[PDB]
Each structure stands twice: as structure tokens, then as C-alpha cells.
Design a protein around this ligand. Structure first.
Ligand SMILES: O=P(O)(O)OC[C@H]1O[C@@H](O)[C@H](O)[C@@H](O)[C@@H]1O
Ligand SMILES: [Mg+2]
Ligand SMILES: [Mg+2]
Length: 218
């Protein structure tokens, strides 16, 4: 049986992928770049703050000073952090709270593998911190998603091998990171976005302990 579940946060635990998108799109437009639509945003999900800005600049076409790059990343984060202040337990996605409870009752370890430096704040807003056995700090890894480092770190922080773990993700970059760690991915979203070569569910209500067991046994 699997011994740990490694959770992405944004777009898995709650709808904050939507807020990252809205904030990046507002930033891009302030600097005269309009290519940041929902289709392009699939390339930004799971990607670090600095890598996200670089992808937006690369889109069209475009270079800024080192000083301006720092200011732009800060401006987006300040806006995003204002947006999330009113997040509460009522915003936890369907199935997630019950899954956390059921995992703890079956002595399965729970670790956060989010690229977001705002992850700990969000878990506190949602009254979820006490369900987590570890949080892998994205500032401590040498390589961010799609590199596997953060998923490997999350597994190791709870004393489990990645190959004894399931990873839950909403993003192309994060699915690749789970694959390359050795853990088993279960995606949430559209196969049009995430691929036809892993198990994918349409929404988080499908993330039950029963289903994770169904998949692991298959
Ligand atoms: O800017 P933050 O809060 O550190 O987040 C970094 C990344 O965190 C990931 O969880 C998100 O999917 C990305 O969209 C985001 O860029
Ligand atoms: Mg995500
Ligand atoms: Mg605690």
C-alpha cells in the first residue's frame, strides 16, 4: 500500500490557480503583453514566480532590466497576496478535507509539495495546517517544477520513498515532476490539458481514499 500522499496546493486544495492567473494577466497587460490567456496559462501552472515572469517576457518578445524584473515579480506577488486575504475554510475544494481525515486515520503520511512561497499562509487561512506532517519549502530545492526535487523532498520529509507515494496535481509541469520523482501521479483537470497517459479525474470530489486505493491496486 502507498505510505504517503504528496499534495500540490493551487488548483488541488483550493481555487487559487485562478487567482495566480488573474494576477499574472494583470501584470502582463500593465507592461503591454497580451498573450496571457487561459490556454497560455497551462504553461504557467506549477511554475515558480521567477520562471513564470520569464515565460511571459519570452512570449513577446521582450527584455527588461534586472531591477525591473525584481519589481515586476514583487508587484504581482503583492497583488496576489491582497487577493487571498479572505480565503477561508469555506474555500477548501470538495473532498479534500475528508481525504485528509481519512488518510490520517489510516496512518498515511501527508506532505505539501507546492511551488508557492504563500503555501503556509494559505493552509492557515483554510484551517488545514494540522493535517500536514511536512511542508517541503520551495526555496530550499535546487530545481523547481518540472524538476522532481520538490516531490522527492516532500516524500523524504515524511520518511517515505517517492515510489511508495501518490502525487496529486493540476498542472503539466507538476505531473512531469511527479513522474520523474518515481511517485504515482493522479491529475485533476481535462485530459486535453494534462494528457491521456496518466489517471485523471474531472474534479477533486473524486479524490477519495477509496479511489486512491482503487488506482494503486490497478
Ligand atoms: O508566487 P508564489 O506564491 O511563490 O507561487 C509560485 C507558484 O506556485 C504554484 O503553486 C503555482 O501553481 C504557480 O502558478 C505559482 O507561480
Ligand atoms: Mg497547482
Ligand atoms: Mg502541525
Amino acid at each position: 500500500m502507498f505510505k504517503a500522499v504528496l499534495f500540490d496546493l493551487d488548483g488541488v486544495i483550493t481555487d487559487t490557480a485562478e487567482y495566480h492567473f488573474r494576477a499574472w494577466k494583470a501584470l502582463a497587460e500593465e507592461i503591454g503583453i497580451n498573450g496571457v490567456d487561459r490556454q497560455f496559462n497551462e504553461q504557467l501552472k506549477g511554475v515558480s514566480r521567477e520562471d513564470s515572469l520569464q515565460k511571459i517576457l519570452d512570449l513577446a518578445d521582450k527584455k527588461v532590466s534586472a531591477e525591473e524584473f525584481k519589481e515586476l515579480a514583487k508587484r504581482k506577488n503583492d497583488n496576489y497576496v491582497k487577493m487571498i486575504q479572505d480565503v477561508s475554510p469555506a474555500d477548501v475544494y470538495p473532498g479534500i478535507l475528508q481525504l485528509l481525515k481519512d488518510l490520517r486515520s489510516n496512518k498515511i503520511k501527508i506532505a505539501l509539495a507546492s511551488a508557492s512561497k504563500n503555501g503556509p499562509f494559505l493552509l492557515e487561512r483554510m484551517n488545514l495546517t494540522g493535517y500536514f506532517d511536512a511542508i517541503a519549502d520551495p526555496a530550499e530545492v535546487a530545481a523547481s517544477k518540472p524538476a522532481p526535487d520538490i516531490f522527492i523532498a516532500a516524500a523524504h520529509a515524511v520518511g517515505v520513498a517517492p515510489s511508495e507515494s501518490i502525487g496529486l496535481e493540476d498542472s503539466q509541469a507538476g505531473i512531469q515532476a511527479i513522474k520523474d520523482s518515481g511517485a504515482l501521479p493522479i491529475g485533476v483537470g481535462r485530459p486535453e490539458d494534462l494528457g491521456d497517459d496518466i489517471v485523471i479525474v474531472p474534479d477533486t470530489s473524486h479524490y477519495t481514499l477509496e479511489f486512491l486505493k482503487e488506482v494503486w491496486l490497478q
